Design a protein around this ligand. Sequence first.
Ligand SMILES: Cc1cc(CCCOc2c(Cl)cc(C3=NCCO3)cc2Cl)on1
Lengths: 59, 255, 255, 40, 40, 57, 273, 59
Amino acid sequence: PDTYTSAGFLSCWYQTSLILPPETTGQVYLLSFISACPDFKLRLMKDTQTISQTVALTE
Amino acid sequence: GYSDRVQQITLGNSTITTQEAANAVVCYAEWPEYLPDVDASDVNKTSKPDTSVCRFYTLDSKTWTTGSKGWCWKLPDALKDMGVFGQNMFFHSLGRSGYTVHVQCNATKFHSGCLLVVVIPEHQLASHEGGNVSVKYTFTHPGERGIDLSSANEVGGPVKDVVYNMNGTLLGNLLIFPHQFINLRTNNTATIVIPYINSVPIDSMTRHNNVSLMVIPIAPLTVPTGATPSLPITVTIAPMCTEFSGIRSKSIVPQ
Amino acid sequence: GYSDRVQQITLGNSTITTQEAANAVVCYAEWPEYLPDVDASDVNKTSKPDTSVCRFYTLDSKTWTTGSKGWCWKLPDALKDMGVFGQNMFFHSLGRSGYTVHVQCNATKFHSGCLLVVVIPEHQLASHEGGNVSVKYTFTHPGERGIDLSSANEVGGPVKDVVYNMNGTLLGNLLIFPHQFINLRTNNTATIVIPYINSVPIDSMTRHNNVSLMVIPIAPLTVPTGATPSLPITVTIAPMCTEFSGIRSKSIVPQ
Amino acid sequence: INYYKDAASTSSAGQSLSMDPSKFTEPVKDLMLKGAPALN
Amino acid sequence: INYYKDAASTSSAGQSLSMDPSKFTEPVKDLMLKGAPALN
Amino acid sequence: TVASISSGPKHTQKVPILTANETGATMPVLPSDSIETRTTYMHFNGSETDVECFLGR
Amino acid sequence: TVASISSGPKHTQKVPILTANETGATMPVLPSDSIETRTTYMHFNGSETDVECFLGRAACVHVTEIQNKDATGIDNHREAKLFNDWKINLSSLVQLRKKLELFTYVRFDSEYTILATASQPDSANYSSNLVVQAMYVPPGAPNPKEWDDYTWQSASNPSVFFKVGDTSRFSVPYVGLASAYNCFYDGYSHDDAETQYGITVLNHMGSMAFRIVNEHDEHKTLVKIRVYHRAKHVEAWIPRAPRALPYTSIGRTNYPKNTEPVIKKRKGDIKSY
Amino acid sequence: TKDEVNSYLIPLNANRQNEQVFGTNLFIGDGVFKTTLLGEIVQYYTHWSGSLRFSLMYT
Ligand SMILES: Cc1cc(CCCOc2c(Cl)cc(C3=NCCO3)cc2Cl)on1
């Protein structure tokens, strides 16, 4: 994450509202996915902050 | 597998999808178009902001309850404050526009209720005082709030009696105007495309509204047992083919 | 009977006539043009308000007196509040523009004085504090008022020393930038056409100014005997080929 | 002969032999001819 | 120029420039057209 | 190669943005299916994401 | 090519030497417009003033230092120079800086040469042979905390291993975000009221990290790293006025207060020779 | 507060009007995005450019 280079925000709101049928109750859920369009470019490979270690593993 | 039923309208940087439409009406069978030269009078080149003004603005939501009488919005007023559409509006001497109106109201297969969605070209309102009392400016320029036909008479405001369309004609005959119904059992949206209708080629956007959009409950809302007794109605509207002309200082309007 | 001397520039709904010009400069010999697709990156269609933004805005006037050190305006900042140009500016995420700058100063055949009118692409100012003190935002966004090089150092503001161009270079070498002189004895206006110059195809109009226009007295004003010792200088600027893209909510900027 | 695959790895570029000072020395809108009067 | 006899000794391979995400993004048995309804 | 084509207003019966993810597919939706776009080119090949490159240092 | 043509007496109505500088042009006047000349040829091409040539020789851009010593009980390797870094930038040293700042935007590939020499300021039996490891931690990469971390594994990070006393060399493509490097930037990261100003906000391309692979011997060894940078494939736009005052900071234009007059005062009159 | 199947579920409430369902910035290399396959790969590179596809499936 970098400021100059930042991309925006994504929000979601009720346009009208969720309505449940009779005999039904509680919360309903949305699942959300993300994938890249065919548009996408990635460059200049580097090391990931997502994995590290303190001693070599063994068998 | 195309149904009359599912639709997508993309206009500018905004898109609407409905999975329960009932076709769409195009007023008087004409689609909005720009102002041709043969019809032009003002010699000024006009400004066509295109995608920055021709996108969808969603007005604040209303709440249909069993006591609702109906709501009324005027155009271009309702949009007087939306993004760059509104700025352009206050800043040019003249402007012209068509619109896509999308009214939304979803419920379930146990609800009943039916709204009339109608567009009335030149809807001159009546004073509830009678005689020749006028309807002051502010009252006919409610902005995004629109007029709530179940609100009380106010002074200098219009009459809000529904079976008379706010003008001395019967609710039953509003069907001669481009309109579409939202019947919970069928429909969940209404869409009307409005071409620019006037007796002059371009006009002032602030001293004259050229259509009122009206949403009126006709078959009362009836919710399933122990359901909450109300549904929200949302109105989203997009200017289309907008042109502004005679730029200058920026109008100052009452109130 | 055309002279280099008389000129007319009509842009939008506004026209300028000068009867005492000294040709006009077109930065780097290039005239403003829109953004070609081959150079485009953002996929958004852009908005080109045309004549409503590409007209001439006259900023408030300055007063050249014998003690004047020079003034500095930044673009697009100077126009941040002019008509619809400004609205568009705060409302889109990205925008791009070229300009016609016309600086005016008339006197009589008894006055003497000579101003340098120069456009500096990417004029990064220096803090008068030295070291690595930054120059706060507000200080580099004076708006139509511009920066007055004979005003006092302020805190968080830039240095205002003229023989160093506000950045560690000598006044004498500003002539490598597109510029024109106003020598009372010759000239009464200066006109420079600025093409859009950046390292990206389109940018933010609020976090980055892409040129500073600078008017600097170099040969001091000398009025005839018992004349009032001062002349007003007026700056009129017109955006040209403006395009805005990525419309939304409307930026909020410091101060 | 490039021994390497990428363009960044090649040696220095070779002389522009472009050279056109007029964008800097004569950016005037109406063309000035040497010998003709500067201001008409 | 390979200086060595065995194939393992050659340098890195060169870009597939193959690229076909459909085995991963659209492994459906009956073809789906964008724009047509998902479920008929 | 175009990264985005030019596309304008739409009012159709053909909605590319409504799908059924239950199917297991990721439908190839693009910016131009839901906003108005302008042409732009890719200027890029995806060279440095080739698996030979990824595992080759 | 002729450098001067032959030209003789003139008595004309066509005066090329009278102009109006107010126009902003520099009219192309030549010796032969105002004296009588003889033909002469140029014999010269202007080869060595090409911008590729001007920016194309190696310049020292950075000197750092690391030491090889027992890290036993060191709570902060970075702080013991058990390994250092250099948040990459070409504004540090001013010799190459002034040259670059003659332009506004610049685009080029870089060729780096890294010379490493060792020093043994206090009593050693010998000079050990150390191997340096220079790894470029791209921004958003695990920063080496220690001197034998997991980061030094650099399995995806380009790294080079060379011997002290020796030199390492390679080249890097133009890794700029934009179409060119901004030598100057009159803007901010975002519309804040306290956010920094300049390019120091634009030029955030991580840092380089050095370290000695070898464990520690009985004595201590100082290794001093010098990074040289050569631009190749240069492209430069928009010339600007040269730097007159001294520099104070990487990335800001700021000059020091109570600096000295930069124009030499005459010893004599305006009339003096 | 501990990783759970539940942080994949965006809840929806019946009968709310005008209100907001969720919000997030778009730093694809951090925050919600970071553990997704997209987020996870983006992290092997320094720069990205392109369009993203965000979809919501209703349950
Ligand atoms: C201006 C300017 C130019 C640069 C250079 C960018 C960083 O370039 C490097 C890269 Cl991509 C890799 C290495 C490197 N890889 C293995 C050893 O060093 C070093 C540098 Cl300086 O930064 N500001």
